[PDB]
Every structure is written in C-alpha cells, then in structure tokens.
Amino acid sequence: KIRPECFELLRVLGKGGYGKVFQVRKVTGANTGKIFAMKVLKKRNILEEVKHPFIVDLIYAFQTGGKLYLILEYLSGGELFMQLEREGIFMEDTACFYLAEISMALGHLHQKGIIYRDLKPENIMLNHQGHVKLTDFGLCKESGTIEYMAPEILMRSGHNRAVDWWSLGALMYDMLTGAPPFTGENRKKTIDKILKCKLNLPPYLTQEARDLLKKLLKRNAASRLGAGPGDAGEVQAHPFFRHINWEELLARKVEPPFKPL
Ligand SMILES: [Cl-]
Ligand SMILES: [Cl-]
Ligand SMILES: [Cl-]
Ligand SMILES: [Cl-]
Ligand SMILES: [Cl-]
Ligand SMILES: [Cl-]
C-alpha cells in the first residue's frame, strides 16, 4: 500500500493554488530512496490519461481525508524562467527548441481535450535532460437558428484550443524580447492593453519570428494559428519551425540548449 507515511519531505517546491508541492524521498517499497514530487489537495484522472515525453508523469495517486496526494516525477531542471532571467533573452534557435517541444505537448493535450490556458514561463518545467515538461492541471478547462448569434459564441471562445496558441505567442514574445507583449502599470491597465492588442514588433526579430507572433498573437481566435482543425500542426508547419525534425524532437534526441550543470 501507499500512504503519506511512505514519503519523506526534503523541501517545499512550491506553494500553489490551494495546493502545496513537496520534494519527497520514498522510504518504503522497492523504489525506496527514489526522489519524487508530492502535490496535495485539502479536499488526477487527467494526469493518468496522458503519458507524454513533454508532460509530467504520474506515479502514484491516493486519497486520505481530507487530503489528496499526487506523486509525480521530480524534475531537476526546474523552471525555464530561471534560464530566462539568467540571461535576458533567448536566441531565436534556443527559443524555437523550447517552443517546439511545448507545441507537441499542447498538441497532445488538445487531442486529449485539455487546454492549458496559462503558459507563463513559471509554468514550464525541465527534466534532468533539460527538456520541457508541462506540469499544472488545476486551472485547465476540459473541453435554434445561428444567424444572429455572436461569433464568440459560435466558436466556443474562451474555452477552446485557440487560447493556448495565444499563450504560446506571448511566451515566444517574452523569450525573444525578455518582456511580455502587453504589460501595464497595473492589472486593470495591463488587461486593457491585452484587449486593445496593438502589437509592436521589435526590429531585431526575423521575418519568421515576426510572422509567427502576428499569427499567434492575434485577438480573433478563429484566425489565430493553431486555431484550426490542424491545431499544433498549423503552428509546426510555420517557417519558424522549418529546421525542427519532429521525430527527432519527440524522441528527445535533440540536444537541449541548456543542460542543467
Ligand atoms: Cl522523463
Ligand atoms: Cl540563432
Ligand atoms: Cl485518446
Ligand atoms: Cl476547439
Ligand atoms: Cl511586418
Ligand atoms: Cl478583431
């Protein structure tokens, strides 16, 4: 059997949304001495039904009143954000590799009916190898006559795949310029900027990067890249990604730009 007693807490990886995440060592079983991450709820199926190179594995799940425990694989690579702010801006190729891997993860989830919604650099994690792992699934949606119906209503706006694709653009923008596309003195001001969405592209970007951002970072979800029935396929086919060999990338046979230590 498996119980909270089975695990020893080395440290706290993060306080979360109504959830804490620990670094633990297994003190019991055949995997004793093995290192894991424990996520706890005060009061799952999603994670179990996905086994991807670019998505965090789930090893054990168990319930005790009033708490739910999730036992995930530990990622030494930690946040990609650390790498970001370490330098200031990723080179285009370095950005492309991370973005390419995320696209594959997003594509898988979408097939699985899952939308990330949030793609902050904080969200993205790396494994020992230094490859992308996508982690948090708490704030994640779970996807008569129409003539006078609003466009937004028709496309299930706000709760469709397109939202993720936007987030990817913002992430791409952040990686390339060191800053997010729309930023404000305050939240309300920042929100308004995002809504206005008058995109400004720095001169130093390549045609490929600029074109992709314009396509990803566009307010109308329907016209957004990856918005389509193709999904990640549309984005992957973009000239930005021309160099990537997807089979190789999927295999994690492509050397990561940064290998932790
Ligand atoms: Cl792995
Ligand atoms: Cl380069
Ligand atoms: Cl399936
Ligand atoms: Cl959809
Ligand atoms: Cl242009
Ligand atoms: Cl518009």
From Swiss-Prot:
Binding residues annotated for ATP, in chain numbering: 13-21, 39
Compartments where located: Synapse, Synaptosome; Mitochondrion outer membrane; Mitochondrion
Expression by tissue: Widely expressed.
Result of altering residue 178 to E: In a colorectal cancer sample; somatic mutation
Coiled coil: none
Domain Protein kinase, first and last residues per copy: 7-241
TM stretches of this protein: none
Top-rank lineage group of the source organism: Eukaryota
Modified how: The phosphorylation at this site is maintained by an agonist-dependent autophosphorylation mechanism.
Active site: 118 (proton acceptor)
Role according to the record: Serine/threonine-protein kinase that acts downstream of mTOR signaling in response to growth factors and nutrients to promote cell proliferation, cell growth and cell cycle progression. Regulates protein synthesis through phosphorylation of EIF4B, RPS6 and EEF2K, and contributes to cell survival by repressing the pro-apoptotic function of BAD. Under conditions of nutrient depletion, the inactive form associates with the EIF3 translation initiation complex.
Subunit structure comment from the entry: Interacts with PPP1R9A/neurabin-1. Interacts with RPTOR. Interacts with IRS1. Interacts with EIF3B and EIF3C. Interacts with TRAF4. Interacts with POLDIP3. Interacts (via N-terminus) with IER5.
Entry's family note: Belongs to the protein kinase superfamily. AGC Ser/Thr protein kinase family. S6 kinase subfamily.
Domain topic, free-text comment: The autoinhibitory domain is believed to block phosphorylation within the AGC-kinase C-terminal domain and the activation loop.
Name listed for the protein in its UniProt record: Ribosomal protein S6 kinase beta-1
Source species of the chain: Homo sapiens (Human)
The gene coding this protein: RPS6KB1
Segment of the intact protein contained: 85 to 372 of 525
